[PDB]
Amino acid sequence: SMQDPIADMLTRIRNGQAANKAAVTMPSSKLKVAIANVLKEEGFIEDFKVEGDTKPELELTLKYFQGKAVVESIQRVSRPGLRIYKRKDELPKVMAGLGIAVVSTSKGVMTDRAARQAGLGGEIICYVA
Amino acid sequence: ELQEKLIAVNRVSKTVKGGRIFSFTALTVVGDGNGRVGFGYGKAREVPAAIQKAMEKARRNMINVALNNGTLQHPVKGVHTGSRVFMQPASEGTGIIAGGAMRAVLEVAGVHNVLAKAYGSTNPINVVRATIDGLENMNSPAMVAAKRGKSVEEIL
Amino acid sequence: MVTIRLARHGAKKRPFYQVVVADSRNARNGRFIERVGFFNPIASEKEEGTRLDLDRIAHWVGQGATISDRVAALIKEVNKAA
Amino acid sequence: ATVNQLVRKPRARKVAKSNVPALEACPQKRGVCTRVYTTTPKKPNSALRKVCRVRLTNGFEVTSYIGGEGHNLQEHSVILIRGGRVKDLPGVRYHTVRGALDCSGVKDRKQARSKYGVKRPK
Amino acid sequence: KIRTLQGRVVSDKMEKSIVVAIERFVKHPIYGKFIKRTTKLHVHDENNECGIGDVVEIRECRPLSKTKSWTLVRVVEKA
Amino acid sequence: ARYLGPKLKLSRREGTDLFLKSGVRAIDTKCKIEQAPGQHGARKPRLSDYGVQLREKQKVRRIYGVLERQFRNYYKEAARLKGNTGENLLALLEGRLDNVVYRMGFGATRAEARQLVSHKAIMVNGRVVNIASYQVSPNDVVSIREKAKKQSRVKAALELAEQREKPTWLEVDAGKMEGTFKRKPERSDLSADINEHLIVELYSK
RNA sequence: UAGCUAGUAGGUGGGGUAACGGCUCACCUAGGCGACGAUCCCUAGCUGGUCUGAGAGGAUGACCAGCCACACUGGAACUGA
RNA sequence: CCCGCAGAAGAAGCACCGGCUAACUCCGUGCCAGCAGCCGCGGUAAUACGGAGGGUGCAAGCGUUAAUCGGAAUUACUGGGCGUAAAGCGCACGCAGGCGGUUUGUUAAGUCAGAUGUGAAAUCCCCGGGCUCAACCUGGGAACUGCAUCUGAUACUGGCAAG
Numbered sequence A: 001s002m003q004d005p006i007a008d009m010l011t012r013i014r015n016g017q018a019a020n021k022a023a024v025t026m027p028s029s030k031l032k033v034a035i036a037n038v039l040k041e042e043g044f045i046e047d048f049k050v051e052g053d054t055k056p057e058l059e060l061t062l063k064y065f066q067g068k069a070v071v072e073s074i075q076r077v078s079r080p081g082l083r084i085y086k087r088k089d090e091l092p093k094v095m096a097g098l099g100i101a102v103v104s105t106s107k108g109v110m111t112d113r114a115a116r117q118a119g120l121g122g123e124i125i126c127y128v129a
Numbered sequence B: 001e002l003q004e005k006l007i008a009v010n011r012v013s014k015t016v017k018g019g020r021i022f023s024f025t026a027l028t029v030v031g032d033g034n035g036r037v038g039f040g041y042g043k044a045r046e047v048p049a050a051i052q053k054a055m056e057k058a059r060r061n062m063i064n065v066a067l068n069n070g071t072l073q074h075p076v077k078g079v080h081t082g083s084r085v086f087m088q089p090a091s092e093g094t095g096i097i098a099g100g101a102m103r104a105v106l107e108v109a110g111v112h113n114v115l116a117k118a119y120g121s122t123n124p125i126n127v128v129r130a131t132i133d134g135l136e137n138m139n140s141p142a143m144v145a146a147k148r149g150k151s152v153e154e155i156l
Numbered sequence C: 001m002v003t004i005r006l007a008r009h010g011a012k013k014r015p016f017y018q019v020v021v022a023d024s025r026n027a028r029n030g031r032f033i034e035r036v037g038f039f040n041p042i043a044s045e046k047e048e049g050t051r052l053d054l055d056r057i058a059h060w061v062g063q064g065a066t067i068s069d070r071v072a073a074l075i076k077e078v079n080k081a082a
Numbered sequence D: 001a002t003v004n005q006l007v008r009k010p011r012a013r014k015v016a017k018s019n020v021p022a023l024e025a026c027p028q029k030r031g032v033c034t035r036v037y038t039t040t041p042k043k044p045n046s047a048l049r050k051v052c053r054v055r056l057t058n059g060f061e062v063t064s065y066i067g068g069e070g071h072n073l074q075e076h077s078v079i080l081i082r083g084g085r086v087k088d089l090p091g092v093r094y095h096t097v098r099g100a101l102d103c104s105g106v107k108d109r110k111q112a113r114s115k116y117g118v119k120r121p122k
Numbered sequence E: 001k002i003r004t005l006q007g008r009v010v011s012d013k014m015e016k017s018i019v020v021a022i023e024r025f026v027k028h029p030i031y032g033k034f035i036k037r038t039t040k041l042h043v044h045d046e047n048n049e050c051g052i053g054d055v056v057e058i059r060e061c062r063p064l065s066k067t068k069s070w071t072l073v074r075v076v077e078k079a
Numbered sequence F: 001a002r003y004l005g006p007k008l009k010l011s012r013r014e015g016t017d018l019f020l021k022s023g024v025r026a027i028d029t030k031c032k033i034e035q036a037p038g039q040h041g042a043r044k045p046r047l048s049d050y051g052v053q054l055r056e057k058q059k060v061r062r063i064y065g066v067l068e069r070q071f072r073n074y075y076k077e078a079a080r081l082k083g084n085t086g087e088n089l090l091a092l093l094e095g096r097l098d099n100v101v102y103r104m105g106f107g108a109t110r111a112e113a114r115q116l117v118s119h120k121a122i123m124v125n126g127r128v129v130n131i132a133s134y135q136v137s138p139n140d141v142v143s144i145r146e147k148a149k150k151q152s153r154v155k156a157a158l159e160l161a162e163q164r165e166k167p168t169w170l171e172v173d174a175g176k177m178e179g180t181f182k183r184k185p186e187r188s189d190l191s192a193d194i195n196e197h198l199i200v201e202l203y204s205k
Numbered sequence G: 001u002a003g004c005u006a007g008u009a010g011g012u013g014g015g016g017u018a019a020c021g022g023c024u025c026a027c028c029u030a031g032g033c034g035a036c037g038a039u040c041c042c043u044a045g046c047u048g049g050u051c052u053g054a055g056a057g058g059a060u061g062a063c064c065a066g067c068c069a070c071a072c073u074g075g076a077a078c079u080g081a
Numbered sequence H: 001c002c003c004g005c006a007g008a009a010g011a012a013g014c015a016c017c018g019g020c021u022a023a024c025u026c027c028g029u030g031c032c033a034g035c036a037g038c039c040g041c042g043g044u045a046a047u048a049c050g051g052a053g054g055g056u057g058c059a060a061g062c063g064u065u066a067a068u069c070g071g072a073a074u075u076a077c078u079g080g081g082c083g084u085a086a087a088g089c090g091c092a093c094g095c096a097g098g099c100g101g102u103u104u105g106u107u108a109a110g111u112c113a114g115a116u117g118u119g120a121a122a123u124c125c126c127c128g129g130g131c132u133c134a135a136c137c138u139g140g141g142a143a144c145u146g147c148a149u150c151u152g153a154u155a156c157u158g159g160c161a162a163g
């Protein structure tokens, strides 16, 4: 069974980058769209496009810069088998602040730095480097 | 200006109809102290020759590393055959807290402040392989800015 | 009953007394309710040596705490000096 | 490996046995030489290594190497044994202490005297 | 405002008394997984105003029997 | 608690000059400074990393006259203190009272200085201090008392010191025989040949 | 070590306690605990702490201080705040 | 604690030196005697045994033994693996359990934020102070990662309701 859609999405992105695919599509969800927005804002992908009504498909346009993938690494962290929540003081710094960590806070899904500025922790969905 | 130092020299044998043929392998590592490091693995029937071969090899195919103020840019892992290595930037004045081979490559590279450990196998050749890979696979804030299409101030 | 007394701390030949309120039954250096000061009988010049938290002492006395002779002497000294 | 598995039954710490279990975490122990004899070493060595089967104060019957040249041992001789194996003899885990209860120091030793219970010459 | 706990009525046979599981969703000390732990409590309920499976709020009180030191305050979701 | 043996021997073993003699007569004339100590000195096996570190550590320890436990303690304190550990360690060593007197110039050698301190000839802030390990603090005046002021050794030492290079971090008056420890010396003021970093690594393995 | 428990689990009323209470007693109900390890077996005083360790941990509970239990072994109460 | 007296006077050992591991030569023995933490050494030239000289390391101590943690990512939560190295049940069905596509609403258990109370003193750490210095004592902080309660956020996970 599919047991983790966010994880699946991340993997899809990684494989697309590996195989140099221009875009990657998957069943859309609200959490997925939010994650995509965070990625776009932070600049790890070029674009996302949700398309359809009954079963809509999110389509991300991946980002390349010198023949190689912009998203160097991208791991899910809080996975279903083991949820991870951090307090604002325990929020991780990925790649010494270069990479980002998408964190689901009380005020919506946001990057780790933004969450820290706000002053709240939450479920750490994934790290991106 | 291209400071070089030999990590390990090891004698290896091949067997023939007659008896054993001994020979020496020299693992050297050179670097300019500003980022550039290159390792070389020479083999010859006697040690000095082996060392010379290693030095020549090392001198070519060196590799530049984006170093931040005499230390690493972020915590970096490195893997290879067995030698899996972890290395973390540390505050100025800590000095290089790093194993043997690892210490050599880092030192010639020009990193003055690191905390390293070699996990897994500690086979000098492999550990050097791991360390160089790890150092290379490390981008700077300039590079990340370039990749993501932002300014360095937006990233911090 | 609750009392206010010196508790011996320091080294051999160099006593330093912590003034503590404590139930008299308790051992000298044992269980105590509150530590309301200290007194250093070997304190040199250009050193304070004594400090009695007077408000706390007053409160405890009001509550009904008896006072050691030495502590009383110290209190008198603090009062005069201050 | 799965967190669920670990939660159900966590990881067992590897209970390491002692290589000197007759000492029973004592630094030395007294025993009586039941029998003192010589024995042949293990494979790449030739010798007649001196060893004594000792009844310990706590019941155990061990065998103990006797280092140094020459010794004043026999049956019913109370000695102290210490931790340490002779790699060389199979199954010997303990040394006698030279220079204690009923064991003399080695004769004419000028070095490592402390190891062999020998007093300082003058 | 008083301290009170909710729990499902696991049984109600012994008269004037119920047993109330109070599942708490604790985190594991080492592994970090969140495990459901349970705390059965013998609760006193006069009038036997409760069925099995019903969620019910209870408060702590002076001990009423060998094992029974909690009383219910209001029943909810009687199903 | 003290090394009681040949001094030029110590210097020979280290390689460098450790300054264990007054320097009236050159050490090359006083001993075979070129040849290493012992039956087998004229041999140089290639020294391991551990070995090299150890040799340097020995050098510094011999120079100051600190035994191992005390040295280790100094290192621990230095590490604990904020800033650079090696720099801190060197500062502590300099700070030592015997070292300070030697710098001022009342003792020809550090050994001489230590002896004076031991024998109660030196007052720090008008109090006869006896401990060689006594840490002198910044702005501390340290002076020879008058009974030792008559010492011909002390006056000889002063002359020798006048010959020697004066430290910037102290100020010493030869007639008064009193010096003010103005500040703990900086590493640039201390000798460059000492590689304190090796010591730090060795005590950090 | 997979079943354990009859004052056992709960109720009503008496008795008892400085105090609540199967604390005890008479009767009533047939319960209660248990794979989130009951019961049985082995070992063990507990904590602040100590040692170690980058940390997470591991080991440990001498001294000092808090709490508990015992006072030749096993029972019992009296006196008394 | 201070002052005076005399006179270098009363005061240095222990381990180690083949590699790991800082420090090497000669003699004696000849797989014997012996050594050893590991790897090993010794069968007639022993830098590995025993003695001597020399050296190295610690020093009023130095060695040996026991014991714990470390190194040991060698029980791997951080932080391991399972084709051939140890390791995929012979294969299925399936209760408890673990996990759960997508939308909306509600709740607020988890989660997060803030506050209040507590988390004894000693210890640890920081800046000070006192013992000639240190150990030691000591002032003030910090810390005590916790726990409880109350008030908020609805992102996520959970419950309930509808799709």
Ligand SMILES: [Mg+2]
Pocket: none
């Ligand atoms: Mg007085």
Ligand SMILES: [Mg+2]
Pocket: D043, D044, D045, D046, H031
């Ligand atoms: Mg043989």
Ligand SMILES: [Mg+2]
Pocket: F001
């Ligand atoms: Mg000493």
Ligand SMILES: [Mg+2]
Pocket: F205
């Ligand atoms: Mg360390």
Ligand SMILES: [Mg+2]
Pocket: none
């Ligand atoms: Mg009743």
Ligand SMILES: [Mg+2]
Pocket: none
């Ligand atoms: Mg009644």
Ligand SMILES: [Mg+2]
Pocket: G044
């Ligand atoms: Mg017991």
Ligand SMILES: [Mg+2]
Pocket: G053
């Ligand atoms: Mg560790």
Ligand SMILES: [Mg+2]
Pocket: none
């Ligand atoms: Mg005792």
Ligand SMILES: [Mg+2]
Pocket: none
């Ligand atoms: Mg009795």
Ligand SMILES: [Mg+2]
Pocket: G080
């Ligand atoms: Mg009575």
Ligand SMILES: [Mg+2]
Pocket: H022
């Ligand atoms: Mg060597």
Ligand SMILES: [Mg+2]
Pocket: H028, H029
């Ligand atoms: Mg011989």
Ligand SMILES: [Mg+2]
Pocket: none
């Ligand atoms: Mg030996």
Ligand SMILES: [Mg+2]
Pocket: H030, H044
């Ligand atoms: Mg021979």
Ligand SMILES: [Mg+2]
Pocket: H018, H048
């Ligand atoms: Mg050897």
